[PDB]
């Protein structure tokens, strides 16, 4: 039996009945800020409320538009509690603030109007650095860059990264505007140049993205890359690739070159329903990306990857959390050609499988007996020249493959051992990592005395402990791992750390 | 592009229903009307004693619906006239 | 201040005697040799058995923020290196700096300065030189700067 | 003494401002104008009128107060522009009316008035569009 | 620098015959001084 003042909403209460907070939450979906419920039950919805104005405090650097455009409750319209509550999640997913506090205040001049107030404290966003080196052996070396997610508080994401040295020079410039249109359409792109002394390349790309739902968005765009190779050391996989394109490198002769100009199309799909931008406790994220060639390009291929992660709390306080991380990917050729070798997938390092040296997981190079030369004494890989061997030379020099899968499980725990001014920036986890990288089109029948790189079952495994700390200079991650499953040619590195901003 | 990009619903103005609009009569005081309907969100700031009640809804992937009332009062706070625009022209 | 000790490896039995600050003693195996160590700021570490070596040093305080730390290390499988490290620290309302320098011998010379300002400002530069010894270093300088916000 | 001796003492109340020690300038309490700034945004010539105006309001609590009045009116202006694009036609009318009532004298209002000229032409409220056009012409020059 | 010294003077506004402007808020009123 429901009694009291039900302002035209009697069915809704019978429906929720067949509670203590659901009647209030229900009325909160309409402009009823302060109803009363007593208990069969007698309620009083009260008066309909309107929002007189929305004001902010504590945004000393970010542009006001940055926050106002994220609200779903509009001024001069009736209040809803869900319409306001979504503002906290929307601001938190930006990653710009330490916290979002909210309130509702009564207007002294009338019982039926309120002010809605959001109060935030701005966090450090990115960093600028550079460095130098000189000397009798170092010669001249210089590197520099800057990266920020919120440039001068204006909402643009920018960065510049590059270096100059005696063997390799490069630079990359990237800019993007999450808001080109008032509805959330984003634009952006980058330019890069990378000349490594021989692998010289450069290129550019531009993309567009736009939301299609409250939690989902799409991306697509265009780009171009130039690739100029020379002085390529003979390898079986490299020559297989070259042969597939009509090239005929001379046997055991590194005096060679090849270049292409390739235009491609980019696309992707993103789902993001996370609660927080740093140490999320709920939600999941799915990032599906890929690109295909445009007919008329020198290369013909496609590449697709998928990155996922899920956070699930197992308590009431959101302190004990289970995090699953998975990545898959595959690419291939079109038109009868193989996928270019410089697009191969790699794994190993803090971004994939812990405890292995970067880009060491997977197939290794097999070298031809290169023509004997003046580098045979002590300047080369002995069996890679005629001076050391007359047959196919095995190595531990990882070259990567055409497909991979990596996964881990991390059990996230609090570390209530240090003062809050530190503890709120530190979280730790126990982890188990595994992954595999493998090839296709591997003629293991022709190479019967050599490893068969087509067998994906050779899964590499490790586990260990990691700590993440949101340092004021940029998040850092430190860890130690012990490998359990390793194969011939693998190299371990148990003490590792890197920048924690991915 | 403009045909598929998601846009959230936009609400503006006072919330009206015929059940309550039909209750207003000439001769009611400003306090009686404000009580029955709620505080106006718009008025003439330039010396005319009148209130504007605007009900506006612009849902996503939809046109705009709007209904308005105008309430004209004299210098004594007595309602003198009511206008009604049930739909946009 | 004195007494015997033993340890069982795991095979191998090692025994010895400690006698007195600076403590010295000897050990034999069932290789055998003498040892000594001391901690005072200063330290001594001496060992010689049927491999041998020594390490020692002293921390002299010049000013509250400045120090001289003569040290030496000698090994034999004595041959080794000696030197004196120096430095001084600086601080202020929102910053700290440490400057380091020293000189040892194969002249092995090094200088540098490392600074931190407020929360987001970091700098440092270090330089290595050597001359008149087993090997020379004519130019070896590295430096970094960081500014976050 | 010399200002360099005051700064030396700070390392070891104009010195508080000279050394950028704002926490102390506040602890010592139109000085809050010193808070409505930024060194990097200043260097690049960025207009800070769209940032939090609470410090300016605290400062306001001779002609320097006119600068502050404009400082506050500009903030209100930028908010109205956002809503003009978003389409919150009522929020726009009410906030601009607020600007007009509170700061009839600043330039930000004269710049704002066309926002009402447009707002009263999207809601079919022609009488107000006319009144706004008339007051715009009356004060034009 | 003392950017405030470049602030433009404030103007007064008027209404056309038949209507008035909103009543000036009492807040932020600056007196005329020498």
From Swiss-Prot, chain C:
Localization: Cell outer membrane
UniProt superkingdom: Bacteria
Membrane protein topology class: Multi-pass membrane protein
Name of the protein in question: Autotransporter protein EspP translocator
Organism, as annotated: Escherichia coli O157:H7
Organism classification: Bacteria, Pseudomonadati, Pseudomonadota, Gammaproteobacteria, Enterobacterales
Gene: espP
């Amino acid at each position: 039996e429901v009694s009291g003042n039900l302002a035209g909403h009697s069915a809704e209460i019978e429906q929720l009945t067949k509670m203590e907070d659901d009647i209030k939450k229900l009325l909160g979906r309409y402009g009823y800020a302060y109803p009363r419920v007593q208990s069969r039950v007698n309620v009083d919805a009260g008066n309909r409320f309107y929002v007189r104005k929305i004001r902010f405090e504590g945004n000393d650097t970010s542009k006001d538009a940055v926050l106002r455009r994220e609200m779903r409750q509009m001024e001069g319209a009736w209040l809803g509690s869900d319409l306001v509550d979504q503002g906290k999640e929307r601001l938190n997913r930006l990653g710009f603030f330490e916290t979002v506090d909210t309130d509702t205040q009564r207007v002294p001049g009338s019982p039926d109007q309120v002010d809605v107030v959001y109060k935030v404290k701005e966090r450090n966003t990115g960093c600028f650095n550079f460095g130098i080196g000189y000397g009798t052996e170092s010669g001249v070396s210089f590197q520099a860059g800057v990266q920020q997610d919120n440039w001068l508080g204006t909402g643009y994401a920018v960065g510049i990264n590059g270096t100059k040295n005696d063997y390799q020079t490069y630079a990359e410039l990237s800019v993007t505007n999450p808001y080109f249109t008032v509805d959330g359409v984003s634009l952006g792109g980058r330019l890069f140049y990378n000349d490594f002394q021989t692998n010289k390349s450069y290129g550019t790309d531009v993309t567009l993205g736009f939301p299609i739902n409250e939690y989902n968005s799409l991306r697509a765009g265009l780009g171009y890359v130039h690739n100029s190779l020379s002085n390529m050391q003979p390898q079986v996989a490299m020559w297989r690739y070259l042969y597939s394109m009509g090239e005929h490198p001379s046997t055991s002769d590194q005096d060679n070159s090849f270049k292409t100009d390739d235009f491609t199309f980019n696309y992707g799909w993103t789902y993001n329903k996370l609660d927080r931008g740093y140490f999320p406790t709920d939600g999941s994220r799915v990032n599906l990306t890929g690109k295909v060639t445009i007919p008329g390009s020198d290369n013909e291929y496609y590449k697709v990857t998928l990155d996922t992660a899920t956070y699930v709390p197992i308590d009431d306080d959101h302190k004990w959390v289970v995090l699953g991380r998975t990545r898959w990917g595959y690419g291939d050729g079109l038109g009868g050609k193989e996928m270019p070798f410089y697009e191969n997938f790699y794994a190993g390092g803090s971004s994939t499988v812990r405890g292995f040296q970067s880009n060491t997981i997977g197939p290794k190079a097999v070298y031809f007996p290169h023509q004997a030369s003046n580098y045979d004494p002590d300047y080369d890989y002995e069996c890679a020249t005629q001076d050391g061997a007359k047959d196919l030379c095995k190595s531990d020099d990882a070259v990567g493959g055409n497909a991979m899968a990596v996964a881990s499980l991390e059990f996230i725990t609090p570390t209530p051992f240090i003062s809050d001014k530190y503890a709120n920036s530190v979280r730790t986890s126990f982890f188990w990592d595994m992954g595999t990288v493998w090839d296709t089109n591997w003629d293991s029948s022709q190479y019967s005395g050599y490893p068969d790189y087509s067998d994906p079952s050779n899964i590499r495994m490790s586990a260990g402990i990691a700590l993440q700390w949101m340092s004021p200079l940029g998040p850092l991650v430190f860890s130690y791992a012990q490998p359990f499953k390793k194969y011939d040619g693998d190299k371990a590195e148990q003490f590792q750390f890197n920048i924690g901003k991915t | 592009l403009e045909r598929v990009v998601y846009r959230p619903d936009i609400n503006q103005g006072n919330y009206l229903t015929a059940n309550d609009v039909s209750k207003i009569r000439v001769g009611m005081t400003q306090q009686q009307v404000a009580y029955a309907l709620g505080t106006p969100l718009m008025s003439d700031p330039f010396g005319t004693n009148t209130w504007f009640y605007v009900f506006r809804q612009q849902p996503g992937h939809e046109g705009v619906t709007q209904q308005t009332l105008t309430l004209t009062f004299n210098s004594s706070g007595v309602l003198t006239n009511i206008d009604n625009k049930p739909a946009l022209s | 201040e004195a007494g015997a000790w033993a340890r069982i490896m795991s095979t191998h039995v090692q025994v010895g005697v400690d006698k007195k600050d600076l403590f010295t003693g000897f050990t034999v195996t069932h290789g055998a040799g003498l040892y000594a160590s001391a901690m005072f700021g200063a330290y001594i570490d001496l060992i010689g058995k049927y491999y041998a070596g020594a390490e020692a040093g002293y921390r002299y305080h010049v000013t509250e923020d400045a120090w001289i730390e003569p040290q030496a290390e000698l090994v034999y499988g004595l041959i080794g290196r000696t030197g004196v490290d120096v430095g001084k620290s600086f601080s202020g309302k929102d910053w700290k700096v440490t400057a380091r320098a020293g000189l040892g011998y194969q002249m092995l010379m090094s200088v540098g300065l490392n600074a931190e300002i407020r929360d987001n400002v970091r700098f440092g530069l270090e330089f290595e030189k050597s001359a008149f010894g087993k090997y020379n270093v004519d130019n070896a300088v590295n430096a970094n700067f960081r500014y976050c916000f | 003494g010399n200002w360099r001796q005051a700064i030396t003492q700070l390392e070891a109340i104009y010195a508080y401002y000279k050394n950028a020690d704002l926490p102390l300038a506040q602890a010592a309490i139109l000085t809050n104008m010193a808070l409505d700034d930024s060194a990097l945004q200043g260097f690049f010539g960025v207009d800070r009128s769209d940032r939090d105006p609470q410090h300016a309001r605290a400062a306001f609590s001779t002609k320097r107060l006119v600068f502050l009045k404009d400082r506050l009116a500009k903030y209100e202006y930028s908010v109205a522009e956002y809503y003009t694009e978003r389409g919150a036609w009522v929020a726009v009318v009410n906030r601009v009316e607020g600007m007009l009532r509170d700061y009839p004298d600043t330039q930000a209002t004269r710049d704002a008035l066309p926002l009402m000229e447009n707002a009263y032409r999207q809601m079919q409220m022609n009488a107000q569009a006319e009144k706004v056009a008339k007051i715009i012409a009356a004060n034009s020059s | 620098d003392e950017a405030y010294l470049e602030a433009a003077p404030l103007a007064e506004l008027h209404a056309p015959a038949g209507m008035i402007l909103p009543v000036t808020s009492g807040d932020y009123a600056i007196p005329v001084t020498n």
